[PDB]
Amino acid sequence: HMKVGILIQARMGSTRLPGKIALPFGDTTILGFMLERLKFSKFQENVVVLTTEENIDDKTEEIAKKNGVSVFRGSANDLIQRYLDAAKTYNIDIIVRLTGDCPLIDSKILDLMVDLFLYNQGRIEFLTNCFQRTFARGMDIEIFTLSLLEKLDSICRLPYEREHIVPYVEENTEKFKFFEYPNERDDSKYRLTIDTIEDYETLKSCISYFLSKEFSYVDLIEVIKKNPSIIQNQTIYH
Numbered sequence: 001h002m003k004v005g006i007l008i009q010a011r012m013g014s015t016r017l018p019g020k021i022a023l024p025f026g027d028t029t030i031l032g033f034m035l036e037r038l039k040f041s042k043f044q045e046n047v048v049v050l051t052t053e054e055n056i057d058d059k060t061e062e063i064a065k066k067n068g069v070s071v072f073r074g075s076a077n078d079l080i081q082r083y084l085d086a087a088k089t090y091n092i093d094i095i096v097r098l099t100g101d102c103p104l105i106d107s108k109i110l111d112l113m114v115d116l117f118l119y120n121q122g123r124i125e126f127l128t129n130c131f132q133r134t135f136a137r138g139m140d141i142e143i144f145t146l147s148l149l150e151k152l153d154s155i156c157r158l159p160y161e162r163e164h165i166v167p168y169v170e171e172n173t174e175k176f177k178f179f180e181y182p183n184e185r186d187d188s189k190y191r192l193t194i195d196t197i198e199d200y201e202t203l204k205s206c207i208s209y210f211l212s213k214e215f216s217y218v219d220l221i222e223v224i225k226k227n228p229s230i231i232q233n234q235t236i237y238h
């Protein structure tokens with residue numbers, strides 16, 4: 001009965017490293033690489049890129065269209081409104097919130113988290129793997145109901161809350177049907193999001209050890225563990 005949507009927020013004018021989603025990455029762009037990885041999700045048919053109406057994000061729309069996913073163009077700084085508009089537009093009941101600085105997101109982890117959410121319908125309204133952090137940065141996945149998002153839209157007036165969506169949930173967990181999803185070990189010391197040039201260099205080194213874009217998260221950590229010099233956004237100690 002429930003429609004799951006993977007709603008990826010991305011924009012060219014990002015606060016950190018503006019333009020990064022359009023950087024060359026493998027045979028595509030940073031954002032295009034992410035979309036190709038999400039094509040392997042069992043929920044791939046309802047992927048939408050949520051970006052702004054500013055002219056610069058014609059590039060974001062272009063990248064999404066090249067990858068055959070839908071595009072929603074809305075509020076630049078009110079992400080609650082952008083996600084609520086998109087979810088209503090596409091009749092989404094369960095929102096999988098991703099951001100375009102996570103190009104190596106693993107669709108198998110996403111699918112497991114959605115499966116857990118759906119199996120507990122009515123006992124969970126918010127599932128995250130990035131409150132407590134045991135995955136590398138850049139695997140961040142948050143899942144919540146349209147109903148929860150509507151409660152946040154009604155409750156939250158602060159600009160920080162409107163821009164980041166989840167902060168009120170994270171600081172008031174006992175007010176929600178809140179649950180967390182762990183990694184099997186603590187990989188939080190690894191940073192696999194793109195906010196700096198050093199992140200980019202690290203991520204470029206990562207994908208060079210795999211022949212396709214279908215590699216899993218655990219494959220990636222094992223390659224980093226075997227080739228510690230992949231990590232260029234953090235000092236390496238032997």
Ligand SMILES: [Cl-]
Pocket residue numbers: 009010011050051
């Ligand atoms: Cl954005």
Ligand SMILES: [Mg+2]
Pocket residue numbers: 099101193
């Ligand atoms: Mg980010």
